Symmetry: C3
Subunit: 386 residues, 3 copies
């Protein structure tokens, strides 16, 4: 009763799922790239997409296609690397699905079902880009974007807010009230710090006047909420901010969940600028202080990751983006970065390498002549050494 | 007197023109993709582009280059597959030219000359995207876009209308009056149904407030005109409409000429949405009722064709588009879809396959949590089967 | 003390620097393309980017990355082909650096240091796109864009002006006052003619109302300044202008420095139009009269160079751009054109070939039906010949 075409395609999918991944020749001394994505639309199990029944699907047509797999939350759970992937259906709605592997760079396979995330209202059209936090209160929190129609004459006009849900296993989710930020009508790129700050739940936020353009909103905010089960933030203290003629000029936002180090919170974030071709997204780092996490204590000039080779092209070209990283006990760091809103990659680094990058890459000299003086200082050091 | 360089380039062009095309490994159970485009700028005969005379063209320079070949009307005519291609010159003006083959997927060759299409006014700057209709009144009609300067201070401001011309052979064309739509100042993506409706000429239309943004214009309209030689439409009844967070959010429009089936009119159309990289065009289907062709009776969620691999990049990236299909008597369907406003491809399907897609692909569940429930229902069916 | 990783990477860089370049199969009878760029981010010497000291750079991390190398001025200097490249750092600021080769198409190597260009004010954030002029007054002039924050609430709002500097060697630069144009608040794509006109310094200019959109500004202007050391232009006489539905519709600007020929000034310039994917840049030619250099005496329809194959994609896709060419005494012409604001290419032609293109390529027929008549005339000539 299973269509004859299924077995051959299932065998091909199994081959893909198991395919080795290889470190490429890319080098910057900070992280490694890999030949293949860790997740693509073709990693979604065939029986999530095809009706296997030859009676009701005689031609074995794809009934529910997958358009893209990207922007994934990431966490280590019972010694497996777990990705809470943003999966965009053929119908253009995204949903979460979990893939796991015993390796950080290959072999990811989706669980039996996608994520059932309870809706709070009847007009939640999309949910996306979940950041996962292993919180000291004992829960795993997912903080994600919730998008609703604005209900105006402009059909494309939408409103973003931060959803909050918690879990022990990434299968069973308790949906808490959406975050309220008293000083901003919309939020995106919100993420929860793993530790209390002054006994409160602490977030990096991103206040926005609109759905695309931020305001008013000058950068990544830091905010405190008394109660995660009724989360309300008032003040949003600016941390890493938009700066003219830098990678963060148009807007910026937190990326991966804040990473705890002895030297501060390592924030792998994204910056946006406008070009003749549209918006360009890159990934950068900044470190915030442990006792004062609204205070930036390191921010290199420029980017850490930008679209490279085949990363440059996809549904939304000229974009790399991350909302997930995994840190192993030995200090290995797996940065899951998507490209062009289409596919998901991994970059492999370490805490020592990322901290050296963050603290020892020169700060942005901001103006061309000072940038040259800065680079000439380096050249002169090297020439002496030679 | 013919430049020595001509013979070698002519031999290379002949090799291209005759080159076999091969079905690729792409699979969705609905249509096949092919390795090569059916038409490109290099398919245009060398002697349409080069001055062959070595006296007046000593260096054998390309005098009238071709920039792109795309958005083609299509019709079967004396047992040949005929494409009325949109050919964009080096000078950025498009014109129509006919290519024919005895095969639907390869071997297309242009006729001796491009199309001489009489202008009605002295300010018709561009004509493009012709839909061909084999009408029951015995004529072949071409319905195309006519673009004129708006004549304002904004040099780029333009006005679109629907031109109508008829022919028996795609060489000799009678230019009729442009369509008038009393309730809309502009039109694009207009196409004529092959059959009368209540004794009148019937069109799918696309009312627009502006040259790029539609309004006001909520989707694809259905309209009736008493007289094709003085075509005037009043009411435009909405059919497939723009829907928030779907592939048709920003705008949509008819694509290929309506295809007659026993189950309704099969409309292979396009949907547009905005992204950080600009507008994204995909192709989708909807079926309208035979007795009430303003009434949509099937509309899958999502798209049928989206830019894939090398289709993604060109003059206008992230676009696929069709205004032509050919249906053989045995039910084979050839969908001619262009990518990125640069080149023309073919997708091969059948009426049975396209109808199964159209009626049996789940309708858009519109909101993420309902999309998941819908996909989980499919997964659960397949797991039981297993 | 030099990190062990340096030697292997230095050997790989040397291999790149020396790599042969090969003419491709591209043909239009006017210019040749080459397989490889003449300059990329990887051509920048490793010791401009890495700290070679293993004590201060234990992981051998890239401290000052290079994002792109493009839009280069070009001049022949002591029998070497010299490129004053726009080098964009990882931090998104550009600066000038000179590369030289004894061949026009390969083997380019950067000098010991980038260019130290004195700033006039403390708010010069970026400088870019220098056009080099070997002037009859005995100096080499560089005319470049100077960009400053507009200082408004809009962080991205910027102001462009034309900087002027002179040199004998491309190392030691005297920075003169920025050009003042009394009738336009901003300027970009300004270039100095190599000869006096009526005893004055003569420029092609590009008046602009804004930083991105021109106005008001209708095309490329011609202006005269009494004193290059206090350069002030009043009237800007229009030359090549924006034309609806041509490659120059949205805006245009001078490209490479005007090239002296017996038949007029050969201007290799750029044209811009808007598309669904963003702005598209192509390169075209026009010739101005020797005695009246505000007067256009040849302007082909269409473009000379457009993005081709891998040129199409980069930081700013769908762009080719030039602000540098080198003319050898034997008439060989090297056009240095960048693609997608990422990398720098060379196109090789000759004065005889470029003049034949400029004067004998049909003028734009402006409207589709007249474009067809024009092409049919050519076809008919060729068919007779056959
Ligand atoms: O698209 C690039 C990035 O934009 C953000 O999101 C999108 C979102 O993915 C779209 O579905 C929606 O239509 O509009 C948003 C535009 O901001 C960013 O946070 C990422 O989600 C995305 O990669
Ligand atoms: O460009 C994508 C699609 O846009 C529509 O047309 C263009 C037209 O091709 C351009 O020449 C003109 O400048 O503006 C229009 C923008 O809508 C669409 O119907 C297709 O023609 C085209 O593939
Ligand atoms: O980007 C395409 C072309 O735009 C012009 O310049 C840019 C400039 O390079 C950017 O750094 C700045 O942010 O905005 C300008 C937009 O016009 C053009 O003259 C070239 O510089 C560039 O290739």
């Amino acid at each position: 009763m299973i269509h004859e075409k299924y077995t051959e395609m299932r065998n091909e999918q199994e081959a893909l799922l198991s395919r080795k991944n290889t470190k490429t020749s890319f080098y910057n001394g900070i992280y490694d790239r890999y030949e293949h994505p860790v997740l693509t639309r073709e990693h979604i199990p065939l029986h999530w997409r095809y009706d296997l029944n030859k009676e009701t699907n005689p031609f074995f047509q794809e009934r529910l296609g997958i358009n893209a797999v990207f922007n994934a939350g990431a966490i280590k759970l019972n010694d497996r690397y777990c990705l809470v992937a943003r999966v965009e259906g053929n119908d253009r709605k995204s949903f979460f699905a979990v893939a796991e592997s015993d390796k950080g760079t290959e072999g990811f396979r989706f669980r039996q079902y996608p994520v059932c995330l309870p809706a709070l209202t009847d007009d939640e059209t999309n949910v996306y880009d979940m950041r996962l936090t292993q919180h000291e209160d004992g829960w795993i929190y997912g903080v994600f974007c919730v998008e609703k129609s604005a209900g105006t004459a402009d059909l494309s006009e939408a409103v973003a807010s931060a959803g909050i849900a918690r879990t022990k296993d990434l299968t069973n989710w308790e949906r808490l009230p959406d975050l309220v930020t008293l000083r901003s009508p919309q939020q995106r790129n919100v993420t929860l710090l793993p530790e209390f700050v002054d006994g409160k739940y602490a977030f990096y936020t991103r206040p926005m006047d609109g759905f695309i353009e931020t305001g008013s909103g000058g950068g990544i905010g830091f905010g405190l909420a008394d109660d995660i089960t009724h989360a309300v933030i008032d003040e949003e203290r600016m941390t890493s901010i938009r700066r003219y003629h830098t990678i963060t000029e148009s807007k910026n936002g937190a990326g991966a969940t804040p990473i705890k180090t002895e030297r501060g919170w390592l924030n792998i974030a994204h910056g946006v600028r406008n070009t003749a071709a549209g918006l360009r997204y890159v990934i950068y780092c900044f470190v915030t202080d442990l006792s004062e996490p609204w205070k930036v204590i390191a921010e290199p000039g420029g980017y850490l990751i930008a679209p490279f080779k085949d990363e440059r092209v996809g549904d939304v070209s000229n974009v790399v983006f991350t909302n997930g990283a995994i840190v192993d006990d030995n200090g290995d760091v797996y940065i899951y970065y998507a490209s062009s809103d289409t596919r998901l990659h991994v970059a492999v680094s370490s805490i020592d390498k990322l901290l050296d990058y963050a603290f020892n890459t020169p700060a942005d000299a901001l103006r061309t002549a000072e940038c040259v003086k800065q680079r000439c200082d380096l050249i002169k050091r090297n020439i002496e050494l030679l």
